[PDB]
């Protein structure tokens, strides 16, 4: 299942990583990539943004439509165990590098002393090109899967082992 161009157009450079437009007003990312001490995000003052973050998942809901080109899509708290997700990793050049992952259990974990409310997954060696998810710049990339004719987003990239074989997305409680 190939994420279509419009779905990739939601993936946006943010802080030290990426985030994702769920709708014209809702942007999600991983908390540790969010810049701090700033007065605005995407030009909008803090006073016009409703922030909801917990467990390394950050959601911003802007008061104004920031990406009216987008439809609203479903954001879920993780996905059923065994779901194959695509992690929509972009690189700075604009190259698209989707990573296929088989999802495991949703749980609360501590990672580098940070509480991560997340879902573990395993990289699918057999569905990915050899030689992703293992550099700081990849955090915040969305985990998506296709349900019927619709794509669902269910987490943001938060952690991975040194090898990248085991990953964790933060999920919204
Ligand atoms: Cl889309």
UniProtKB/Swiss-Prot annotation:
Signal peptide: none annotated. Inhibited by the chemical compound K36/GC376, which covalently binds to the nucleophilic cysteine residue. Inhibited by various macrocyclic inhibitors. Residues 3-173 form the Peptidase C37 domain. The active site is at residues 32, 56, 139. This is 3C-like protease. Coiled coil: none annotated. It comes from Norovirus (strain Human/NoV/United States/Norwalk/1968/GI) (Hu/NV/NV/1968/US). Homodimer. Monomer; in solution.
